[PDB]
Amino acid sequence: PHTYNLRNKRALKVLAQMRRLPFLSCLKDRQDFGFPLEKVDNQQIQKAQAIPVLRDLTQQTLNLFTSKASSAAWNTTLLDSFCNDLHQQLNDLQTCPPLTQEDALLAVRKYFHRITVYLREKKHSPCAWEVVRAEVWRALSSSVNLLPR
């Protein structure tokens, strides 16, 4: 609960630094992605079941930002930092309305698929990448709501 928070702080700091475009540059590309955990309380999914969901979320985020398209869209030093942070998060997690755990996992999958399809359909424009970066930032910030303190 504690270490996930700390390294997620660092991940969010770097992901905010990765922004290249001024705010409000990409209005015509904005897109509701329907992140499935935006309103998911800790009463809904407990510690035993939140950890797999967080693990899959971290894994899919790492996969997204370690693609070749990502290497072409973002500063390489910041990418190194962000990807390393996500991977450390993954190692920590592996060391150990959506309702159940399986529903959460499947919904997270479809959400990252919507992100992939959006980027393809937008031909990886800088604005599409910025829309995705801000979306992932909000998802990562929301996700900490599934851990107790």
From TrEMBL:
Localization annotation: Secreted
Protein's GO biological process: defense response to virus
Respond yes or no to whether keyword Membrane is given for this record: no
Which GO molecular function annotations are given, in alphabetical order?
Answer: cytokine activity; cytokine receptor binding
Can you quote a single GO CC term? extracellular space
Q: Which UniProt keywords apply?
A: Antiviral defense, Cytokine, Disulfide bond, Secreted, Signal
User: What domain of life is recorded for the organism?
Assistant: Eukaryota
Q: What is its main location?
A: secreted
Protein family: Belongs to the alpha/beta interferon family.
Q: What is this protein called?
A: Interferon 1ai7
The source organism is Mus musculus (Mouse)
